[PDB]
Design a protein around this ligand. Sequence first.
Ligand SMILES: CCCc1nc(C)c2c(C#N)nc3ccc(OC)nc3n12
Ligand SMILES: [Mg+2]
Ligand SMILES: [Zn+2]
Length: 313
Amino acid sequence: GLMQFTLPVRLCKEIELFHFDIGPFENMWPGIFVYMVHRSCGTSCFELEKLCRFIMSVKKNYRRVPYHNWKHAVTVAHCMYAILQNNHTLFTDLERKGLLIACLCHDLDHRGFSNSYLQKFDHPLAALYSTSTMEQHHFSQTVSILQLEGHNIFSTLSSSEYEQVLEIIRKAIIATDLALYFGNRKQLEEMYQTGSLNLNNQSHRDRVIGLMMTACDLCSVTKLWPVTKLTANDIYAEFWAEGDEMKKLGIQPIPMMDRDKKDEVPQGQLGFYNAVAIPCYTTLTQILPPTEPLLKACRDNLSQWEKVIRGEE
Ligand SMILES: CCCc1nc(C)c2c(C#N)nc3ccc(OC)nc3n12
Ligand SMILES: [Mg+2]
Ligand SMILES: [Zn+2]
């Protein structure tokens, strides 16, 4: 356990920042994830052999899709790292362990299609899981990999603690269902502004961790413009593919997913920042003040999309 990971000086330094890009070198991401766990949790949190073999099974079970891929998993785990390191007294030992694993696992075996498409296709996963279809599958796959021989990174926990960490991971991953985000933030907004928000109330912590999960999962919109711009291409390649598949069921897809309507994207991103991203990072900053850079960076990109619409870029 005297074996720490060290990154090159630039990554060692930039990794602490919310807007850190994990780069185009796939083979460095596992070491980036381990480095983050060792700093955020401790070198003793996870047996290195088991963690390494858990990370590569998770990697194996992410698909070669444009966006909902292994790079998204590590990118969302990093944002969670950045939140935990900037608020380090606010979270228990079990939450620091569970939430970085929850972020790595949150989109396991994603095919690049929405819960809606599964439903209209009548996918078997939609029969098994009536709401949060993909997100219940993702948790299912997380438990599957935890129960592979030699992959139980939580072996040293007690019966109680183990059940608590798997319950943290479950709620964490279910919250990545953006349909539940809108009601969760509203409740949080009320609780905060009436002064009834209480982080000793387990049902309140759940809600806050829920918002943190939405904030990490949307964190591509908190990157420097050139990263956010190029990530949007990957996100939209999935949306257009799903639109194609909708048209193949004989359903006209919403404009967002229609590749014939690419000209409507800059307005559609405006809608998304205002209705989803800005509110998310606003309420997050109100609750967790040190997370303010995510809101600042998100606003900067909103401003850059406004520029696109005016044909300034
Ligand atoms: C599950 C995709 C959620 C998501 N994550 C990001 C980082 C973006 C994004 C950007 N840039 N633009 C989006 C536009 C619409 C939309 O509808 C759900 N999701 C978006 N989105
Ligand atoms: Mg998801
Ligand atoms: Zn995701």
